């Protein structure tokens, strides 16, 4: 389920920018849904849709840019244009759309989990975030780096927040085949355990030690696994045993 406006204001103004995802076309213009300013459908005309084949490109599902022409802020009749949007501004518009999408994604899982409406959540979020910080995504990022935005208003739900944090926070598989023929071994193992987590540790078999490495942004996982391996190697060379790595 996806309803209600994304920003603070309902209907757009003159000059401000939107993003459209066209469903069906060719009669008057296109009376279709948007992904920037509300999912309530507005209208484009078949006149400022040709700049430089025309019935083939856009059609169904494909991402295209729009600028808001004439708004009737009373009942609900909205004019849109594709021709007026400059090539430099298009990229910016796209970026904005992306940001909006990300924001929506952020506030969707939460809506699902606590089994509560999305609009209320949006209302509760978009006051110290969308007005004082800039956009919402950036504010969220800032919060994740150092908590300073959520402390504006008291949270009615913390589990949701925790879930979001978890989502923001990838496991890589590693098997170290420990084949010790040592005098003192348990102590060594303990030592190894104590310098590896500082990550997710599990044990099913006696010589098999199962470790899943946490990655920050995918490719940093080679830097920690290798370190762990090195540590393990260091562990058993002094006592009198061996470790095999695949």
């Amino acid at each position: 389920t996806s309803h209600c406006r994304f920003y603070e204001n309902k209907y757009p103004e003159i000059d401000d920018i939107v993003m459209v995802n066209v469903q069906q076309i060719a009669e008057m213009g296109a009376y279709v849904k948007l992904l920037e300013y509300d999912n309530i459908e507005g209208m484009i005309l078949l006149s400022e849709l040709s700049r430089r084949s025309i019935q083939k490109l856009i059609r169904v599902g494909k991402n295209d840019v729009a600028v808001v022409l004439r708004v009737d802020k009373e009942k609900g009749y909205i004019d849109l244009s594709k021709r007026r949007v400059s090539s430099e501004d298009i990229i910016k518009c796209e970026e904005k759309y992306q940001k909006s999408k990300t924001v929506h994604s952020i506030l969707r899982y939460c809506a699902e989990k606590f089994q509560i409406p999305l609009e209320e959540l949006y209302k509760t979020i978009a006051w110290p975030l969308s007005r004082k910080f800039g956009h919402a995504y950036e504010a969220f990022k800032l919060s994740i780096i150092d908590e300073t935005v959520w402390e504006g208003i008291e949270p009615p739900s913390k589990d949701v927040l925790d879930e979001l944090k978890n989502y923001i926070s990838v496991k890589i598989r590693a098997d170290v085949e420990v084949s010790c023929f040592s005098y003192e071994g348990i102590d060594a193992i303990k030592d190894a355990l104590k310098s590896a987590e500082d990550v997710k540790v599990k044990l099913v078999a006696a010589p098999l030690y199962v470790l899943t490495t946490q990655a920050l942004d995918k490719q940093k996982g080679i830097e920690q696994l290798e370190s762990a391996i090195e540590k393990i190697t260091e562990v058993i060379t002094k006592y009198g045993g061996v470790c095999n790595i695949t």
């Binding site: 008057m28 213009g29 009376y31 209208m43 006149s47 022409l69 004439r70 009749y77 909205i78």
Partner: protein, 302 residues
Amino acid sequence: FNITETYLRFLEEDTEMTMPIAAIEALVTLLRIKTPETAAEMINTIKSSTEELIKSIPNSVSLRAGCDIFMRFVLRNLHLYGDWENCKQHLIENGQLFVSRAKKSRNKIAEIGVDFIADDDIILVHGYSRAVFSLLNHAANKFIRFRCVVTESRPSKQGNQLYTLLEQKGIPVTLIVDSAVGAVIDKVDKVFVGAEGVAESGGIINLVGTYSVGVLAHNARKPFYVVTESHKFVRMFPLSSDDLPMAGPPLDFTRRTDDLEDALRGPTIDYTAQEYITALITDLGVLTPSAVSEELIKMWYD
């Protein structure tokens, strides 16, 4: 404000301005009240109105053609990328202007394109259009020894009306029956037609008996012609030899009734194929061979 009301307004009088033009005028009048600057408040509403009109139709076709033409014109209008006011004003002007144009078109038809009846080439005519009558009345002042033949019109005796319009010019005429339509194809030179629309297929959307006539013309090789003011190219395709957007039933086999009741649902609309127009007389130059289709393509850019 209503377009329906406007349409109702003209009936007893008329017989001058093209119907499709009156409708257009009405549409324009409807438009120029509720601010034609915006495209959100306007075009959709216009479309809705057109739909309503369509729904309300008793037995009339060309309205749709008119309205789509108007729409096309509107679309054409806002490509100049200047400003909203000037263009709007121009649009507003172009309703009455369009009506004015019709008369000029008619004049053009009746002074340049009337050289199809000259050497007493006897005319077998069916389908009452204004243009056909206008050209005939304009050729009566030249006295080129013309003669008229009338196949009887029986939706409800329009034939009588027709014969009454040719009595004001003083010209010998004769009643013809459409069963003895095989009988006389001899002394009469050619077959001329008024209609209700020209199709995307090419052929003619017409009245109470036309396909038979066309067939007979084909058999006899005495050419078959259609004459009108040009704005009846409706987006419609009669793919079959017994199908169109029809107002009444298409041959309704009525039940075993009693005292001569359910019968007269006799087909008052019929159609013949694209290989039948030997020439088509239009105000945008005398053009026929694949002209309508070309025009349609130009309009829809496809």
